[PDB]
Amino acid sequence: RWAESRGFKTEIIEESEGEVAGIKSVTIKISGDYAYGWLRTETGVHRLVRKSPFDSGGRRHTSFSSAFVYPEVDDDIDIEINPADLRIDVYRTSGAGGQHVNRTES
């Protein structure tokens, strides 16, 4: 809801609803300007103190969930071959035949 106010579209990525209720692990894709830069600071673990209905004796039990933010952008490996290496070794290796041959293999 905060991202919509920032114009960012929150593209769903992964989710897994619990057997009874609630989601276990969820990740989404926020797309926009200053999305990561403004969220790079929000890699915290929030603390929740709420009245628990699941506990028959409705008492305030704490609850925890971590907010992890990563850029997700990825540009990688192209070519790393350089001329400062490659000691090219070309040596032979014998073989087999029928009478007197040295079937070599460089």
């Binding site: 600071t41 915290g44 603390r47 103190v49 709420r50 305030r60 925890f64």
Partner: protein, 52 residues
């Protein structure tokens, strides 16, 4: 780095005993929880996270 999931990092405490939100990293206290749950997150970055 994100291993601390349980009772390790209490960045933003959201209570319902008195309905008060406290980001201890600075101390930006707000008694308007529901709006924070729907938009009042902008204030956390600009004020609290301004200095870091």
């Amino acid at each position: 780095n994100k291993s601390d999931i349980g009772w390790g990092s209490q960045i933003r405490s959201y209570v319902l005993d008195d309905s008060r939100i406290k980001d201890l990293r600075t101390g930006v206290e707000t008694r308007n929880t529901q709006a924070v749950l729907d938009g009042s997150l902008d204030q956390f970055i600009e004020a609290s996270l301004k200095a870091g």
